[PDB]
Symmetry: D2
């Protein structure tokens, strides 16, 4: 338009009266597709205060009724699927096929979470005291907040708000300043179906301003955020002031282990069909590939051939490409610098390794060989489509190198030996380990990272429980 | 002696080579009973590095074997019970009877926790994918740290190390600089029974130095601490730098609600026999008493009479007193100032209200009437034996005032009406609610505070789980 | 028609070739509404063999896919709701309003059960052996059977088949010979949506013949049945021959306790609005009323007035009545005999007590006073609308008399005292206890009777688990 | 002596006044070692009535106090370990080493079970009704009974009474008429430590008499039994009369699968060191050995050599033998007949195959080759040390043949391929599957058989739950 978006506070869209706006750009063409308010703490406070006023009534509603509200939202999403998918493609730069999957998955995820209504249980504990009953109830936290990243922006809205609402909490969400459009569409659905005012709020702005208020406001019981480790650190430090609970997912460096006795065809496909599910921008797919000698040569060749076939370009104009552009300028620059450094350190460029120059932010699928566990490229989130390869002799070497990281969210291994599999599972220090398949968490699993990958977690029963707290009642006589 | 204590690092006692020492004083006589090293970050690092080296081997041990080690420690504690009780009395200032209970309870707690060995379960989750198994294993965090307060110093050692060790973690503990003696005795038992080196480490020093290193060191998977909200804030802020998990218990202002239809005798006894279980220094017993009109006069009189009978003095020389001295000078001063402020604001002194002057730090049982929810005494941890009383008309008023606090750890109510009880339980926003009995958490319950009272929790199954993290394995075909 | 119904075996309706048929009559008019085959063991065997052939493929399907099939069935039911409700009214004799509720509830129940797909969990247990993993998987039983009663005939189909199918089992169902029509309609929906052949089978006939084969066939992993204790005994005895698992619900004599401090209005309404939800033919609503002296007179009068307003008649022609006819002739006769015996024993008829003579099987709402715990009417399922009332002095007397029964499925009490409630809960020996409300189990609860009321149970997580068995895997190294 | 044993009823030993006695013989020498009363139903009734009188008070005791009682019993057992081991050796015919293990294991098992005291949980379920709480409590069944077999006679006492007592139930136990001595010693310990009268009762006699009364008495909430499928059938049929819950373990035909890629050394040792842990009389060790072609010849030879080294004889006079005598004459006879039949059918005797003639009941380790899945020896519990071997080509053949049995308690497989292991686990229809190790259930697992192997189960959390039933409370407002 470029359309100027309003925030969603206390059951209604509120037109921004400030003079400062933030431009939302299309990563493929660099053109301005929309504008959002340069929100400030006060805007966050209004949303938080509204969420607080609505929380008692919301938690008082039988759980099945909150589930009913969630189902109305998912149904609204499916009705506007193509519209929302296009928004994601346009601002996030991901290929049409993946955007479509994200939208459909988000709706299914919400429905799945709504099913917890009559299932989350409190407990009755035996007491040492005659005639006493120890009742442990599961209560809502109260007001919660969600801070979202640019990757899987739409899904992450649901990943936080669905469990939050189901358990009786209210929420205030802030999407990334780079991908707010899909979030506005989510708010419109919430508004259209009539969700009780204050239960779901959407605030817009930067991390340093709005994000910080969502983390530091004393009325917030828990702050949930997904994205960079740097932002997570600032969020937690701020939450500390009020002893506010934090729920963080800060990505990492997913390592992949390919053994000699591994199904070469399966391994290569799993690694490329994972590093491709979002222009090589996801936090679950192998960013560190370890291949042992015995099969090294064969593996590197097939993998090299697979990456050559990977075409990049504008997602909106090409439905036959496997990769879109990077989110923004800084992202592209950091990729270049890291690849260059790697090369200077001794890394062998088997493919790509040269940034494209022109409209949008494109970087060619890059394959690096003769890489050393020591090199900085093995200890720095490379955003773009860069695959560093490291050879090894024994399982212990591979497991040891994979564990050698400040991140511990996702891992994977390919082999056919029972002992090797059980050994890798026991030795790998990660929240997730994929065996002979591609990386992608199920809604009923538990996406939780070790070390700097995060705190708490998301999805399944355990993800739902992050939004609940206990009240232990000692009923005497 | 005054004996000069060494630290316990990597399976052996290490003599302090520094020139700076911290004097440990007897709160009843102000005499120096011992001295501990003015530990520094480097000392904490040595302990942490030792804990890291021992962790893999320790976690590799079958759980029942770790339990066996824990049982040896509890047995060592019971053998030295009277010796340890005296240490607690001497440095903590608590009465002989309570010290004895703390020691016996600590041993039982350790045994109870050891019983979790073959019981904590991982899970097997149904997958949407044909032939796939989703295995969710429960793994240890790795290296953990514990920072302890002066109240219930001995028990708190076990409250953190027992669950930690059982689940395969190693630990580094720092007792409060005011009550380290009981902790040294704990370390001697660990050393005598031969616990594998590095699994249990004891470092000595101040919070700003040693404590901060236990919270900020990158090798620490989780930092556990009990004490003041101010220290908890600094601990969490520091942990944020490395996205380190935190487990905090920061006390509060336990409110008590006395209804008209309440067993007057029971209520009064429960409130005084709780505010007395540690010279009125515990974080679970009523520090805010709400009494409704109908029974106000009767209740205040019986309560006043009960408090007059409360004798204070040196725990070591008197086994017939209900109260000992406050932990230190600053503690005593803060109590005076808060009582004085309360009075100036309109508070009516029905008993006590005047600090004692002489050796040690004694403050008389104080009863304040005509107090207003507004007054600062209702929003500030009063350490000493001060009981503020506030009258009310309806249950809703009492519940509303009790919830009006930045703390939400413990609560209580006295009544005989089914509807009133269920209403109080549903309305009270606390981690714990005691009905018609005194405040004291069971080892099988879950001591976890709401709002600023903390993060995570302790005791029972949920306390044990704080020391475990998940590893989700997607086994395809 | 009277239409002649076929059975549903191995994915298709099979026309009966036998010469013997069973007439299905309308309890209100005694007219023949339909006819079903006088099935024999061989027919059951064909269904069981078909279920066996389909089970491996069915269990092999991801759980969410089985859930998808279940959702198609519930959706089919809602589409034909009015049609099915009429069938129930016509053959079961229940009032239009209750039939409608049963149908809608059945559909919601199926959807609720389908939600367990990704939720039922296996477990990972710590081993005493180094390097060993103990994996406990939840597997299907295989082929299961369901034998249904005439009360809530439609719902009971789902209560057994929904959990059975969800967990990977196949099933063969036999409805009561008195109420098979609603079951045929259920089979048509299964056939129309295309459920894989053999997964759901419907056989028709008597208990002694078809029912016995469903209990005694060696290929059946578990036999599930709801109805009379006499039939349950024969079913279990037969299952014993092959050590076949049994799941039984055999009704009982639900006792109700009315205290002096009880909300008289609430109590009376709860007792009449429960004894009315199916012409006084349900197995959950008070069939034994205990009222204490203090409020006796008041209670008996209000209750007497409430029962006078209860009109009986043909459900199909009257949508303003609270009661329909009894299921059959024998049922009516047994009611008469029991009321008469009661009277001869000293029972005081305060209302009704005289069977109606003419078309259909009607019995007037009957109120009996001055009844003694001793009388046989207190130890015999009275089918019809008969309410025996017994006075008592203390809570202990009431609890003791309520427990004095071979049945222990459902119970209830009305009071406002916290102590009384907790005392009743602790003292009452029943699978269910309702406090200050009417009797009706939630889908997320657990309907399981004590003593002769049954074995195993239905509904919620525990009901779902009845259809699962464990496979413990000891994976060494 | 031969000593004449009294029963243990209502807290005291009761001298038998009947004229009929049953001789207890030493299976190695056929000499009379003791005599027990030929108990009758009335004796069982006295015990059951006593158990009923004590149950309310026992369940009323806090769970930890019941655990304390259990710990006193285990401690009493360890004090008399050698004495009890000798009793088992003498009457059961098992080798000294295994008897010692059984006694020590029994004591550890009791302690393990006592640890459930503060751990078994009830649940709090979300309701669809505003202001309603659904409380699911775990209650005791009441009076339970245990009927024991001759194998692992001592352990089985604890396997039933430990979980029973811990959860608040009382119990009446009847040991096998062939091995009652160890049970009398158990009763003496119970009497000496002072367990409340009626909680633990011991009755003596035959199955047809005393056993039947323990299964058919209306006051019994659940009957638990381990032994032959024939007796289990009679027990369940009788329990049916009162809809009495049953808990059965009826042995079976444990199959073992040896793949070509299997650790030959490990497999052979696991099979012989399992079939030897009780003179080849256990219900968990391979009684059906399936070996594939590729490794057949090698495996059969090593296995043949291992069995030759197996020496048999009097356990009391030889502490260097791997096998004792069979329990009784009928047992020996049935083994002969089955081996002979097998031979006539085409079975090739590679070793043994000829019954010993003289004092006691000895049968030589027998190895049968060229056996066919069809042969009756593959479908009949062979008691003695007979190992039938069957060759196969593919995994599917082995899995299919193993599943081809009316029993489904225990199974095992030896291989090194990840896919093979996961395939065997998924394909094998048994309550237990051992991979690359010998057969022996852990106390924290769940010993539960599929098909005719039983109903319900024992050990771990699930075994404990068999002794608990639910009480669902719907607390409105
Ligand atoms: N926001 C900006 O002005 C600029 C961002 N970038 C790049 O954008 C990328 C976005 O990465 P993501 O994976 O989304 O992770 P991220 O952590 O940078 O952002 C995720 C979410 O956290 C918020 N956030 C950032 N800092 C925060 C703070 N201090 N307190 C509270 N919230 C905060 C963001 O606004 C967003 O909603 C980064 O790699 C960064 O280098 C580059 C130039 C400028
Ligand atoms: N079936 C008949 O020929 C007659 C039945 N009745 C009455 O019908 C009533 C029906 O009561 P419900 O609450 O439905 O309980 P119920 O136990 O009599 O019937 C419930 C279900 O169990 C089956 N069943 C009955 N006996 C069986 C057996 N021995 N083995 C296997 N299955 C068996 C039935 O066919 C039905 O599907 C009884 O009160 C009875 O007196 C009266 C006269 C005849
Ligand atoms: N009891 C006897 O008079 C004789 C027994 N035997 C042999 O003794 C063996 C013992 O085998 P186990 O593995 O112990 O299994 P089992 O089932 O024969 O005995 C286990 C337990 O069940 C009891 N029992 C047996 N029949 C029962 C019934 N109908 N009702 C209630 N309880 C009953 C027994 O008394 C014992 O306590 C059998 O193989 C049998 O052939 C041989 C000749 C006589």
């Amino acid at each position: 338009v470029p359309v100027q978006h309003p925030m969603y506070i206390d059951g209604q869209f509120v037109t921004w009266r400030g003079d400062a706006w933030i431009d939302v750009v299309n990563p493929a063409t660099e053109a301005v597709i929309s504008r959002i308010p340069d929100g400030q703490a006060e805007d966050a406070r209004k949303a938080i205060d509204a969420a607080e006023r609505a929380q008692p009534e919301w938690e008082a509603l039988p759980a099945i009724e909150r589930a009913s509200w969630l189902r109305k939202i998912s149904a609204g999403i499916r009705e506007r699927a193509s519209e929302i998918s296009a928004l994601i493609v346009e601002e996030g730069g991901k290929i049409q096929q993946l955007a479509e999957v994200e939208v459909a998955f988000t709706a299914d995820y919400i429905d799945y979470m709504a099913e917890w209504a009559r299932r989350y249980e409190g407990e009755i504990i035996q007491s040492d005291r005659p005639g006493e009953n120890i009742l442990l109830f599961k209560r809502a936290l109260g007001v919660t907040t969600g801070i979202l990243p640019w990757n899987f922006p739409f899904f992450l809205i649901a990943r936080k708000m669905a469990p939050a609402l189901l358990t009786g909490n209210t929420i205030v969400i802030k999407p990334s300043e780079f991908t707010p459009n899909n979030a506005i569409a989510f708010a419109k659905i919430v508004d259209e179906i009539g969700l009780p005012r204050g239960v779901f709020n959407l605030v817009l702005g930067r991390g340093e301003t709005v994000g910080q208020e969502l983390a530091g406001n004393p009325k917030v019981a828990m702050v949930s955020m997904t994205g960079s480790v740097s932002a997570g650190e600032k969020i937690m430090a701020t939450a500390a002031k009020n002893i506010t609970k934090v729920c963080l997912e800060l990505g990492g460096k997913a390592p992949a282990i390919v053994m000699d006795d591994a199904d070469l065809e399966l391994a290569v496909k799993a690694i490329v069909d994972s590093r491709v599910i979002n222009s090589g921008q996801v936090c679950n797919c192998a960013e560190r590939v370890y291949v042992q000698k015995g099969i090294y040569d064969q593996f590197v060749n097939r993998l090299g051939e697979a990456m050559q076939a990977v075409q990049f370009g504008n997602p909106a104009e090409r439905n036959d490409i496997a990769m879109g552009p990077l989110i923004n300028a800084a992202a592209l620059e950091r990729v270049e610098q890291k690849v260059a450094r790697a090369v200077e350190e001794g890394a062998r460029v088997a493919f790509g390794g040269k940034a494209v120059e022109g409209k949008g932010y494109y970087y060619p699928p890059t394959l690096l060989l003769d890489v050393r566990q020591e090199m900085s490229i093995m200890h720095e989130e490379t955003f773009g489509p860069v695959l560093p390869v490291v050879a090894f002799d024994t399982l212990e070497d591979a497991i040891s190198m994979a564990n050698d990281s400040d991140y511990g969210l996702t891992s994977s291994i390919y082999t056919q030996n029972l002992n090797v599999a059980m050994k890798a599972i026991k030795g790998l220090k990660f929240g997730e380990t994929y065996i002979n398949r591609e990386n992608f968490e199920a809604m009923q699993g538990f996406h939780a990272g070790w070390r700097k990958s995060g705190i708490g977690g998301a999805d399944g029963k355990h993800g739902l429980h992050e939004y609940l707290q206990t009240q232990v009642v000692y009923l005497q006589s």
